[PDB]
């Protein structure tokens, strides 16, 4: 949560280097988790092959995080719109484009641009309107 807290508490469209670093950290951590599960359930043929797979997944996810953060924060500060889901949409689509580059495939890149951009715009909307993913029981 501190990994997400450090991203969340810094305001949108300011200190783009810090926000890019925080999103890169989130990406790297998530890629490390997916690499751990991949290494566990589909083991490699050698330790170095596993290290290579781990680094590949981790760099892909960290690059997606860094690109999303850079594009989202810069489009926020350039337009002076830090509450607009459109900056997060642009961030998600740039993350999809760098994922397509990492897999080196235009189809994956385009589909991921659309899906991740819409997802990030939805996340911005949920931040602005207080949507709960896990709502605590009340009634």
């Amino acid at each position: 949560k501190t990994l997400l807290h450090k991203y969340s508490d810094i305001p949108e469209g300011t200190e783009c280097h810090r926000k890019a670093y925080a999103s890169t950290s989130i990406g790297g951590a998530t890629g490390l988790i997916v690499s751990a599960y991949s290494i566990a359930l589909k083991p490699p043929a050698s330790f170095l092959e596993g290290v290579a797979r781990t680094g590949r997944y981790t760099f892909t996810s960290a690059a997606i995080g860094a690109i999303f953060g850079l594009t989202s924060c810069i489009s926020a500060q350039v337009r002076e719109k830090p509450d607009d889901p459109l900056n997060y949409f642009i961030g998600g689509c740039a993350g999809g484009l760098t994922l397509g580059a990492r897999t080196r495939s235009y189809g994956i890149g385009a589909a991921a641009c659309a899906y991740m951009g819409l997802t990030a715009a939805l996340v911005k909307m949920g931040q602005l309107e207080g949507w709960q993913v896990f709502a605590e029981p009340k009634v």
Partner: protein, 459 residues
Amino acid sequence: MLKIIIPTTMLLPMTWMSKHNMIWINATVHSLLISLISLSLLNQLGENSLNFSLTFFSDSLSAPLLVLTTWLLPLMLMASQSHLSKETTTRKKLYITMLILLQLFLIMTFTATELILFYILFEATLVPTLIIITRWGNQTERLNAGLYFLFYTLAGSLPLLVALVYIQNTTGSLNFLIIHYWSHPLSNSWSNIFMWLACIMAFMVKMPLYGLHLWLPKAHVEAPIAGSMVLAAVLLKLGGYGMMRITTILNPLTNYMAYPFLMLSMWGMIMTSSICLRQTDLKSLIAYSSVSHMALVIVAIMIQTPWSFMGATALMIAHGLTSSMLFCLANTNYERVHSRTMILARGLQTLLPLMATWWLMASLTNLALPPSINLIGELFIITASFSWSNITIILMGMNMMITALYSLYMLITTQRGKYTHHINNIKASFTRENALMALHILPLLLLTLNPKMILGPLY
């Protein structure tokens, strides 16, 4: 509504307990009797609705739809009994049972006073429809058609379920009357925008909206004739009726949320009318024409005027009758040449003269020739759209031009020209087929004498 619902339920024991050779006779007789009873629902009031009980009510919007459903059942039975002549007794009874279940679900869907009950009854219509399409369809493509129809509908409908229960938790009721009388304006926020989308998308995919329509050609083409009849005639209208009901809680959010849908339908009516000009499958051409008329209904509901709602109601009724007639007319040729290719059997007017006359009537009604109720609905929607924005007249005029072109093109290619030389099995039209067309066409023209019966509650 029990004096309508219970007789329909009694069709099932009667169907299952009748002799093997009295199946069609009994079902037809008593479904026509039920349709006679449903006509008394057309006695409506100027202001209030017919609120029978806590769970069923009727107004000028749902009464013509109920009459259309109860009328469609016997015509279905006449259309089916030819291609199902070689089937077993139990399987014929199962097909009749599916049709009766569909009619019963539709009857309760159009009269449900509560939104969630409407949701369950409108979702229940999937099951007999899917069974009909996938079990009694003719081609290997019926399975993929069934999957498309099922999953398009469900991907639309589940968010509607979530939205409905949220509305019940926040407002306290899903009762239609309470929903109308306690109407709150809908503010401009992402929460409300997505509530609007959830409330609208199921009916959008049901109509279907252009871009969400790819299930309809598959489903209406692969289905057996009765399945195509119901899918085109009553099942598309569930989206329009539900949209008319639920738009009373979406204002003023509908003012700007409708722009993408208005654009989609206004251009997609052009797009699908153009597609009809090049369709090589007759049943596919007839299926594709439903998308344009339903796009007009979409525009009418989205602009929210009394004239637009009147036109949308009339257009739904007229399209149901006309599209079912066209599907039956195509099926009569299919049962002779065992193919849906349109240029296979040409010059049919010199072999089936009265069937050619039926074809001309069906084409004329699809043309929206005045004073047919097709034209009444289309013209009312066009006038409301012209008020909404004058530039709408360009697109709607283009659409009526293209509609004329493809309707008369289908007529000319199937009926006119020289007959095909090697097709020597075009037997004379049976009394049953001619009666099917006559029972499609006669009530359509009689409605022109009393057009207010299908102009909805805003008349």
